Structures are given as structure tokens and as C-alpha cells.
């Protein structure tokens, strides 16, 4: 019955969480490590100068 223990874990995680504050609001600069996987380069519209 891991569903109950995982529910308790999640509810302890979100208990007292403020989604308006970035992690390390006072003493850190957040480091967002991005990445991209281009599954398909769509058609480059020459009329609108878009792609």
C-alpha cells in the first residue's frame, strides 16, 4: 500500500509551500539548467518571416 505513504510524503512536501517565492530567495541565485529537443523543424514561412 505504497499509495498511502506516497500521499503522506506529497502532503508533507506541499504543507507550508509558497509557489510565489523562488528557491533560495535570500541567499542564492536560482540556476535553471535548460535543454531543447527539436522533434521537427516546422515549415519556415517566408511570407510572414516566421518559422
Amino acid at each position: 500500500d505504497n499509495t498511502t505513504v506516497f500521499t503522506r510524503i506529497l502532503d508533507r512536501l506541499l504543507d507550508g509551500y509558497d509557489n510565489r517565492l523562488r528557491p533560495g530567495l535570500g541567499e542564492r541565485v536560482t540556476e535553471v539548467k535548460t535543454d531543447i529537443f527539436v522533434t521537427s523543424f516546422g515549415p519556415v514561412s517566408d511570407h510572414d518571416m516566421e518559422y
Binding site: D18, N19, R20, L21, L25, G26
Partner: protein
């Protein structure tokens, strides 16, 4: 930390349907812009596309706090 306490104290007894100074005086709003690109001006529809960064700044005596932090920087969650 304490910023959560500040944000909670600002929204206790707050009614977001009433403009600041609802029955006192008009609200002065300073508006700025930044025109990125003015798109194609097609004459057929007599229209033209524009892309801007509309910024509005006003005074709200209800969102007034007194703590060590001077400014609160927030995303669209508030």
C-alpha cells in the same frame, strides 16, 4: 521565510473588487510601453499588428508593508 508572512499579511482583509481610494480621489496610473515590432500594415483590413510591453504603475495604500526587504518581485501568481 518572512516574505510568505508579508504576502499573507497583505492579503488578509483585502478586497480586490475595490480600487485604491474608492471613495476618496481618482487613481493616477503611469503607463509606459516598449514597441518591439510593428507588424505588416495590410491595407485590405485597414489594420496593423504591434507587439508591446505594457507597464502600469500606481499607488495602493493597502499593499504597504514595513520590513527589511524594500521591493517584492513576483510572477503572475499574485
Amino acid at each position: 521565510g518572512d516574505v510568505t508572512v508579508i504576502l499573507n499579511n497583505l492579503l488578509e482583509g483585502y478586497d480586490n473588487k475595490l480600487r485604491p481610494d474608492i471613495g476618496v480621489k481618482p487613481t493616477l496610473i503611469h503607463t509606459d510601453m516598449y514597441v518591439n515590432s510593428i507588424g505588416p500594415v495590410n491595407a485590405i483590413n485597414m489594420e496593423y499588428t504591434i507587439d508591446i510591453f505594457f507597464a502600469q504603475t500606481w499607488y495602493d495604500r493597502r499593499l504597504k508593508f514595513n520590513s527589511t526587504i524594500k521591493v517584492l518581485r513576483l510572477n503572475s501568481n499574485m
